[PDB]
Design an enzyme around this catalytic site. Structure first.
Site, PDB file in Angstrom:
ATOM      1  CB  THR A 159     -79.286  80.050  53.673  1.00  0.00           C
ATOM      2  OG1 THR A 159     -79.957  80.445  54.861  1.00  0.00           O
ATOM      3  CG2 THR A 159     -77.890  79.650  54.033  1.00  0.00           C
ATOM      4  CG  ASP A 308     -76.637  83.739  55.610  1.00  0.00           C
ATOM      5  OD1 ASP A 308     -76.952  84.302  56.676  1.00  0.00           O
ATOM      6  OD2 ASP A 308     -76.899  82.542  55.365  1.00  0.00           O
ATOM      7  CG  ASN A 685     -83.432  91.548  27.093  1.00  0.00           C
ATOM      8  OD1 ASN A 685     -83.335  92.544  27.793  1.00  0.00           O
ATOM      9  ND2 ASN A 685     -82.429  91.094  26.370  1.00  0.00           N
TER      10      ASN A 685
HETATM   11 CA   LIG Z   1     -78.918  81.707  56.049  1.00  0.00          CA
HETATM   12 CA   LIG Z   2     -82.009  94.451  28.134  1.00  0.00          CA
HETATM   13 ZN   LIG Z   3     -82.792  80.539  58.023  1.00  0.00          ZN
END
Ligand SMILES: [Ca+2]
Ligand SMILES: [Ca+2]
Ligand SMILES: [Zn+2]
Ligand SMILES: *[C@@H]1O[C@H](CO)[C@@H](O[C@@H]2O[C@H](CO)[C@@H](O[C@@H]3O[C@H](CO[C@H]4O[C@H](CO)[C@@H](O)[C@H](O[C@H]5O[C@H](CO)[C@@H](O)[C@H](O)[C@@H]5O[C@H]5O[C@H](CO)[C@@H](O)[C@H](O)[C@@H]5O)[C@@H]4O)[C@@H](O)[C@H](O[C@H]4O[C@H](CO)[C@@H](O)[C@H](O)[C@@H]4O[C@H]4O[C@H](CO)[C@@H](O)[C@H](O)[C@@H]4O)[C@@H]3O)[C@H](O)[C@H]2NC(C)=O)[C@H](O)[C@H]1NC(C)=O
Ligand SMILES: NC(=O)c1ccc(N2CCCC2)c(/C=C/c2ccc(OC(F)(F)F)cc2)c1
Ligand code: NA
Ligand code: NA
Length: 804
Positions: A159, A308, A685
């Site tokens: 979330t 979401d 990196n």
């Molecule tokens: Ca959520």
């Molecule tokens: Ca890099």
């Molecule tokens: Zn959830």
């Protein structure tokens, strides 16, 4: 300390939050335990409920009521949302036929259409179809506005990471909210959903939409609502703010719903108990739209309905326990659940070693339901490594499963039937996007896209300049009627050299050999023309990639392929070739098995050498343009040029050779020809960005030949597969990968079997967007097509997901 003895009189849901110890009346005061003494009484009225009834119409104003049905309510901005329907014979918004909103139809003093984001926690993409019968308001938004069949969340599909990504346009590794729970080793502090640490500003990086708005003089409603404020009150507050005088009124608002996620955890994504939460959410949308209609704002406001992440079936019995694998389970800390993150329990324990933990977790059980990774080896599409809050050891958990440290954790902390957090390409994790309003298109379906793209669009909708982010601005222009963002292609920084024949064979001392000493004016001019670029139109179909950084490189032309050869990295940055549906696969002839040929266009000093590979007992080499797909026995010699060679671990060569020998021709057969661009990537990196020379951590032993961390391929063909890749008139189709260049195949538990049983599965896991490759290489592809630039940007953000 809060001096809760001030008052919320005339302050209810005030926009500017006041500083301690003065008491608060804002929509988050409950979360801080800082509300004034009369906040509930004045600001959270409930009397008489949320709906007008016939007997309430024209009533005498009673300030105690939750909402009003008196004659004065319209000018006060506080009618019940169904006031006009019950009392003035109006219809509900949902019962009105849709009519295209060609222009904003806004009341006087509205400077721009307001934007309202209606965010729903855990709203799985398939609820739009599967729950459509019980969600008529949402269905009207969806069918009448602009919708995607689903929107891809970010990893991890939790979330807080996803909500903050929506608000910033940033990957979690960049905005810093990398989980719902985190430990930051620099702060020595823990972030949890419960408790006060999460309000400290130091966790929250980038710049969220409400800050972008405020900095640029656009007023924002507060996006966050204390959990105990009922949804009906959230809606009424937004509608009341929309009635403020012009100079005080926000232009952007957010509603948040903890449903259907809350019930989904308890009942599973499709539990019969899920119908009621979906009806309730639809009713809330109905209240908003009726409320907008009463304010004459229903053809003025842009509304975004967005989730979401989705929700998967997950139960306690599907839990893997690290105690069944590790001898030393009490020496580690695990962040558990639908992803695992491991670090040392004590920074004082020098017997801690991630290598032995990874090994003890690797392919140990036949149907093992998680896979361990050092974070830099996670699929690059997840963009989940470049943050000190992300532990070095990561467990990618199979959908429907959990990982935990020990059994006692699971019955001393079955309850739940749903969870989320898995790999963001998993179908159950996909969520929703609908845009409705004057700035969105009418009855338009758009392809799936990633939530990192929306911040730019929300900035477009508000006339804001977005802060720097991971969206590709312009890639969502096809969602919009107006306010499109029309970017220009980046300028090429380095121009190529075009070398001719400049070196004699004997100037090379590379320790390479090739049996090519075997021998025509017809055919000699012909091969000279090929070296000058006479077939380049066939093999470089969308122009040459542009190099967007300062470097020295050469374009090298051949019968079957073109390359951009880096003098600095001693190998191509890119190699481009087209394979038609009719192409034939051949073998590497016996006499050419160990053939490597000097390239007389490129100096010995800027070449690889064979002796380095002879001496490096760990390292072999492969070729970027595959000798197997040569157009003729004579063209095949080009494929053994030292300028087509790249360093490859023998374990990786298994993968690569199968890709080149078998899979390319398969794609060409299926897609009606393909154009392939392949190359190395150096990301030591793990920041998702091209390394400079001085960041390279590994070389072929004894040499200055840098070892790639990854190899990519971009595979393009005609979306209309009735046309061949090399004669395509319209939209393109692409799939790409960024394969990790690893000295073992420990990632593939079945790698002892024939490559037909595991290689393609590995490549699917490492699917990528062209845009991911652009970041990692500093190259810009598709510079010369017939297509609109925005269309190309959409193509560059496409991810082939292989979810059926
Ligand atoms: Ca959520
Ligand atoms: Ca890099
Ligand atoms: Zn959830
Ligand atoms: C996704 O989009 C985002 C946003 O565009 C991309 O991220 C950007 O990438 C840039 C390059 O990596 C980076 O630019 C750097 O800025 C440094 C200053 O940064 C601060 O200020 C900005 C602006 O307000 C702010 O956004 C930053 O916020 C980060 O850090 C805070 C606190 O730590 C966090 O709260 C926040 O979440 C964010 O963290 C993330 O980014 C940092 C890197 O900045 C990571 O370390 C974290 O893990 C996390 O992912 C900062 O508060 C600046 O110092 C850099 O300059 C160095 O490099 C230049 C090259 O131009 C060189 O010339 C300079 O000399 C300098 O080097 C010196 O420092 C070295 C390191 O200490 C030292 O070794 C040398 O010897 C030198 O002395 C650099 O220009 C930009 O900050 C981020 N922005 C964000 C928001 O993350 C991201 O790349 C995109 N992803 C993909 C895959 O495309
Ligand atoms: N209980 C709440 O009200 C609550 C609690 C925590 C929340 N987040 C957790 C991490 C960041 C904040 C939010 C989220 C607010 C929000 C609303 C709409 C959004 O979509 C966008 F950005 F598109 F507008 C984005 C974020 C709401
Ligand atoms: Na070797
Ligand atoms: Na293996």
């Amino acid at each position: 300390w809060t001096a809760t003895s001030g008052s919320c009189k005339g302050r209810c849901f005030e926009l500017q939050e006041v500083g301690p110890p003065d008491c608060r009346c804002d929509n988050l005061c409950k979360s801080y335990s800082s509300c004034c003494h009369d906040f509930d009484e004045l600001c959270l009225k409930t009397a008489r409920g949320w709906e007008c009834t016939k007997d309430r119409c024209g009533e005498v104003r009673n300030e105690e009521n939750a909402c009003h049905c008196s004659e004065d309510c319209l000018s006060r901005g506080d009618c019940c949302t169904n006031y006009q329907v019950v009392c003035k014979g109006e219809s509900h918004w949902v019962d009105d036929d849709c009519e295209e909103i060609k222009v904003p139809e806004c009341p006087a003093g509205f400077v721009r259409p307001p934007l309202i984001i209606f965010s729903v926690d855990g709203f799985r993409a398939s609820y739009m179809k599967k729950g459509s019968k019980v969600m008529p308001n949402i269905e009207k938004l969806r069918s009448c506005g602009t919708h995607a069949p689903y929107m891809r969340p970010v990893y991890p599909t939790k979330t807080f990471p996803n909500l903050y990504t929506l608000a910033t346009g940033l990957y979690p590794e960049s905005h810093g909210i990398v989980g719902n729970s985190m430990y930051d080793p620099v702060f020595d502090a823990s972030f949890h959903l419960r408790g006060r640490e999460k309000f400290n500003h130091r966790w929250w990086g980038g710049q969220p939409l409400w800050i972008t708005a405020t900095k640029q003089g656009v007023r924002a409603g507060t996006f966050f609502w204390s959990v105990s404020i009922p949804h009906e009150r959230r809606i009424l507050t937004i509608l009341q703010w929309l009635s403020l005088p012009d100079n005080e009124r926000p232009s952007v608002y957010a509603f948040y719903s903890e449903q259907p996620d809350f019930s989904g955890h308890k009942y599973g994504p499709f539990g019969p108990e899920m119908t009621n939460p979906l009806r309730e959410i639809d009713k809330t949308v109905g209240q908003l739209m009726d409320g907008l209609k009463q304010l004459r704002l229903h053809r003025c406001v842009n509304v975004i309905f967005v989730g979401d992440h989705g929700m998967e079936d997950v139960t306690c019995d599907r839990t893997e326990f690290l105690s069944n694998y590790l001898t030393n389970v009490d020496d580690i800390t695990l962040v558990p659940g639908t992803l695992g993150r491991i670090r040392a329990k004590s920074i004082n324990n020098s017997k801690y070693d991630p290598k032995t933990i990874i090994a003890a977790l690797t392919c140990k059980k036949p149907d093992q339901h998680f896979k361990p990774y050092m974070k830099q080896h996670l699929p690059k599409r997840l963009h989940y490594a470049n943050n000190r809050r992300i532990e070095d050891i990561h467990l990618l958990v199979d959908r429907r499963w959990h990982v935990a440290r020990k059994p006692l954790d699971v019955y001393k902390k079955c309850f739940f039937q749903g969870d989320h957090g898995f790999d963001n390409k998993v179908n159950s994790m996909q969520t929703v996007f609908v845009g409705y309003g004057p700035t969105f298109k009418y009855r338009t379906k758009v392809p799936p896209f990633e939530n990192i793209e929306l911040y730019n669009v929300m900035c477009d909708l508000l006339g804001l300049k977005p802060a720097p982010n991971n969206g590709t601005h312009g890639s969502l222009n096809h969602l919009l009627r107006t306010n499109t963002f029309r970017p220009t292609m980046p300028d090429e920084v380095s121009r190529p050299n075009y070398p001719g024949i400049m070196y004699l064979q004997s100037e090379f001392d590379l320790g390479c050999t090739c049996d090519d000493k075997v021998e025509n004016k017809l055919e000699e001019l012909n091969k000279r023309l090929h070296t000058k670029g006479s077939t380049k139109e066939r093999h470089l179909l969308y122009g040459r990639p542009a190099v967007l950084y300062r470097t020295s490189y050469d374009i090298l032309y051949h019968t079957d392929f073109e390359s951009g050869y880096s003098e600095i990295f001693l190998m191509p940055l890119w190699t481009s070739y087209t394979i038609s549906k009719q192409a034939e696969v051949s073998s590497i002839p016996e006499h050419l098995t160990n053939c490597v040929r000097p390239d007389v266009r490129v100096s010995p000093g800027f070449s690889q050498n064979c002796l380095a590979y002879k001496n490096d007992k760990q390292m072999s080499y492969g070729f970027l343009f595959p000798p197997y797909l040569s157009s003729s026995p004579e063209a095949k010699y080009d494929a053994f040029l030292v300028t087509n060679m790249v360093p490859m671990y023998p374990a990786f060569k298994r993968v690569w050779a199968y890709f080149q020998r078998v899979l390319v021709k398969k794609y060409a057969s299926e897609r009606n020809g393909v154009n392939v661009i392949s190359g190395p990537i150096f990301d030591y990196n793990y920041d998702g960005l091209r390394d400079t020379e001085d960041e390279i951590k590994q070389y072929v032993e004894g040499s200055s030949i840098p070892v790639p961390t990854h190899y990519y391929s971009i595979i393009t063909s005609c979306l209309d597969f009735t046309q061949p890749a090399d004669k395509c008139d319209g939209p393109l189709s692409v799939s790409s990968f960024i394969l990790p260049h690893r000295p073992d195949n420990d990632e593939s538990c079945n790698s002892s079997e024939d490559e037909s049983k595991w290689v393609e599965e590995l490549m699917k896991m490492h699917t990528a967007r062209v845009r991911d490759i652009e970041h990692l290489t500093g190259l810009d592809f598709y510079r010369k097509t017939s297509r609109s630039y925005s269309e190309i940007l959409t193509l560059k953000t496409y991810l082939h997901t292989y979810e059926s």
